Every structure is written in C-alpha cells, then in structure tokens.
C-alpha cells in the first residue's frame, strides 16, 4: 500500500486528491494526471466568471435559439433545475443577473443599487430554462434560456458535480480509496488505511475560524460532505457584512438562523445543491425539505455554537473544539 496526493490551483480554488492504492504507482500517477486535466477542461465548460467558457456562451444566447450542449452539462442542468423546483427556488441556478451585481460589490466594496437589483430579480426565473433532448439515436441535447437577460451561475453545484466526476474517473482507474477535496467540497471514497481500514475523518470548520483547524470531525465512507456558510465569502461596508449566498426572494445575502449547513450524500452534486438551499431556507424549513431526501444526512452549526445532526450521522460526529456542543 502506498499513499499519494496531488494538489493544484484550478476552478478558482485549491483542489487536492489523496489516494491509497496497491496498484503500480504509474497507474495512480496516470489517474491523477487525468483528474487534474479534467478539472482544467471543466473550468472551461462551467465557469461563470470567465468570458470564454461554454456557460458564458450559453448565457450570451439568452432570449434566442436553443443551444447544443454536451450530455454532461445537460445532465448537470437537469439536476440543478430539479433542486430548484424541490427547494421552491431557494437554490436557483439562474441567479446570475443578481450574483454579478453583488460580485462587483465584492471587488469594489459597494452594495448594489435598489432599482438595479430589483430589475435583476426579474431575470432569474429558472422555470424559463428549457432543456430538450430528442429520443432518437444520437439526438442532440439543447438548452434554451427563454427570458431575455437571464444568466446561469452554477457556483452552488459545480464543485459537487466535479467531485462526482472525479470519483467516477478514479473508479474507472480501479481505485477505491480516495479523499477528493475541491475547495472544501469533499468526497470520501471508500476507506482509508491506518492492513487496518478505517473511515475517513472529515473535518467541518468553525464558521468564524481562521479555517486552519476543524471544529468537528465526522467519520464517513463512500459519502460526500459539502458545507455552505455565511463566512466563506463576503465583504463588509459600513459595519455590515454581505455574504455570497443570495436569498432569491430578497435579492440580498440570505438572513438565516444557521451559520453553516453540511450535507452528507452519496452524490456530491446533490450535497452541494442541498447545502445552498438549506442555508437559504434556514433550519426548520431545511428539515422539512430534507424529509424528501431520506438518503441524505445533515449537520447544522448555529450561531450559539450548538450543533444538530441527523440520525444517520450524529453518532459519527466528534467535537474537537469544546466551545461547540453536539445536541443528541
């Protein structure tokens, strides 16, 4: 058994993959080469903040004719629209008109204009994203953005999608033990080694920490762990903090009763979308939504440092920072 890792700056963040394998090292190296090539290629497909991505091209055709996309992107959009509908739009993959207004706020610390923001909100109806795919052999997959000026932003689901694609790639290379970490979006594949095989111990950060040390760790196998939070990306102006997760009803950063939500799911795509929806919805409505998805678990960290975890994971949680308390 040998342990490997590799990390690079790609898709706007640090992406790291750790593998344990008994295969020849040259086979592991080849798999990791392909992981990082995939991440480069997919940055060019999915990115909402590059002018030259496939998504940018799709957005440039809003209000016009349907656009041919590859089956991968079509599938991701289908899943995004599914979580949009299930979450009552709390997760909304067509929020680009609003996100881009706040985004420039980040760069130069300024809050969007009232009427400008109001206008942007009229161009975020995800029910106007029409996906069509014929049923005959080799029929193309198309996307049409019906509403003029609407803009897709898949920031709340793309890391999950890519983590799932990487797991599929690792498995294709006959690997079965890995920790995939895309800017904190984790997939724990199989079991690690201590030969003693053990669950991966996935850390969850103090929402207000310097990010160094985890506050809690959860032991998992074959599971994604994806966290959304109110302090991973924000700017401040005149004593007010404006974070990156938007409430689509208000067009402002969500005012919510949790500091972070972590979703545990067999598919990272699903964990990523649900984490964002749940953050926007807040605790009680999240619990209601999650009743719909029995195969997922959740861990909520509240502003008062209480932690609540669903029945499927609560016994797997260990508190490392004693300021936090796990309710049982």
Ligand X SMILES: Nc1ncnc2c1ncn2[C@@H]1O[C@H](COP(=O)(O)O)[C@@H](O)[C@H]1O
Calculate the alpha carbon distances from 199 to 92, 124, 178, 184, 298 in Å.
Answer: 34, 41, 11, 18, 18
Closest alpha carbon to 265 in 290, 295, 308: 295
Q: How far apart are CA 91 and CA 309, in angstroms?
A: 21
Task: Pick from 20, 74, 91, 300 the residue near ligand X by CB under 6 A.
Answer: 91
Q: How far apart are CA 242 and CA 252, in angstroms?
A: 8
Task: Pick from 192, 244, 267, 316 the residue near ligand X by CB under 6 A.
Answer: 244
Which range in 139-147, 168-176, 243-251, 297-305 contacts ligand X by CB under 6 A? 243-251
Q: How far apart are CA 155 and CA 163, in angstroms?
A: 13
CB-nearest residue to ligand X: 155
Contact between 154 and 96 under an 8 Å Cβ cutoff? The reply is no
Q: How far apart are CA 307 and CA 312, in angstroms?
A: 15
Site for ligand X in 93-132 (CB under 6 A): 93, 95, 99
State the Cα torsion 32-36-41-45 to the nearest 10°. Answer: 110
Which range in 126-134, 208-216, 241-249, 315-323 contacts ligand X by CB under 6 A? 241-249
**48 CB-side CA count, 13 A:** 19
Task: Pick from 166, 272, 299, 300 the residue near Mg ion by CB under 5 A.
Answer: 272
Site for ligand X in 265-294 (CB under 6 A): 272, 275-276, 280
Task: Pick from 276, 277, 278, 279 the residue near Mg ion by CB under 5 A.
Answer: 276
Which range in 190-198, 209-217, 242-250, 297-305 contacts ligand X by CB under 6 A? 242-250
**Minimum separation from the CB atom of position 244 to ligand X (A):** 4
What is the x/- site pattern for Mg ion, positions 155-194, by CB under 5 A? -x--------------------------------------
Based on the shown chain and the rule CB under 5 A, indicate whether residue 98 belongs to the binding site for Mg ion.
Answer: no
Closest alpha carbon to 253 in 48, 40, 95: 95
Task: Pick from 120, 145, 245, 296 the residue near ligand X by CB under 6 A.
Answer: 245
Residues that bind ligand X (CB under 6 A): 91-93, 95, 99, 153, 155-156, 228, 244-246, 248, 272, 275-276, 280
């Amino acid at each position: 058994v040998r342990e490997y890792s590799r990390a690079e700056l790609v898709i706007g963040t640090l992406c790291r993959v750790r593998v344990y394998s008994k295969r020849p090292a040259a086979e592991v190296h080849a798999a990791l080469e392909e992981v990082f090539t995939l991440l480069q290629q997919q940055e060019m497909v999915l990115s909402a903040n590059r002018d030259d991505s496939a998504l940018a091209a799709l957005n440039a055709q809003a209000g016009s004719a349907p656009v041919v996309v590859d089956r991968s992107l079509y599938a991701l959009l289908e899943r995004a629209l599914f979580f949009a509908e299930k979450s009552g739009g709390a997760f909304n993959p067509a929020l680009g008109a609003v996100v881009k207004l706040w985004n420039i706020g980040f760069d130069r610390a300024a809050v969007p204009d009232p009427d400008a923001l109001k206008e942007a909100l009229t161009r975020c109806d995800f029910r106007q994203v029409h996906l069509r795919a014929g049923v005959s052999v080799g029929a193309p997959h198309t996307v049409q953005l019906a509403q003029a000026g609407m803009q897709l932003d898949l920031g709340a689901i793309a890391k999950g999608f890519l983590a799932d694609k990487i797991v599929q790639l690792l498995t294709a290379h006959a690997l079965d033990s890995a920790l995939v970490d895309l800017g904190g979006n984790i997939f724990a594949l199989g079991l690690k080694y201590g030969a003693q095989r053990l669950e991966w111990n996935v850390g969850i950060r103090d929402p207000h920490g310097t990010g160094q040390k985890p506050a809690l760790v959860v032991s998992v196998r074959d599971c994604s762990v994806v966290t959304s939070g109110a302090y991973e990306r924000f700017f401040e102006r005149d004593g007010v903090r404006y974070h990156h997760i938007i409430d689509p009803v208000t067009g402002f950063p969500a005012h919510t009763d949790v500091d972070s939500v972590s979703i545990f799911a067999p598919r990272s795509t699903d964990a990523d979308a649900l984490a964002t929806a749940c953050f926007v919805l807040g605790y009680e409505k999240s619990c209601a939504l999650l009743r719909e998805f029995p195969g997922v678990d959740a861990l909520f960290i509240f502003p008062d440092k209480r932690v609540r975890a669903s029945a499927g994971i609560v016994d797997r949680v260990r508190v490392l920072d004693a300021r936090f308390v796990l309710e049982r």
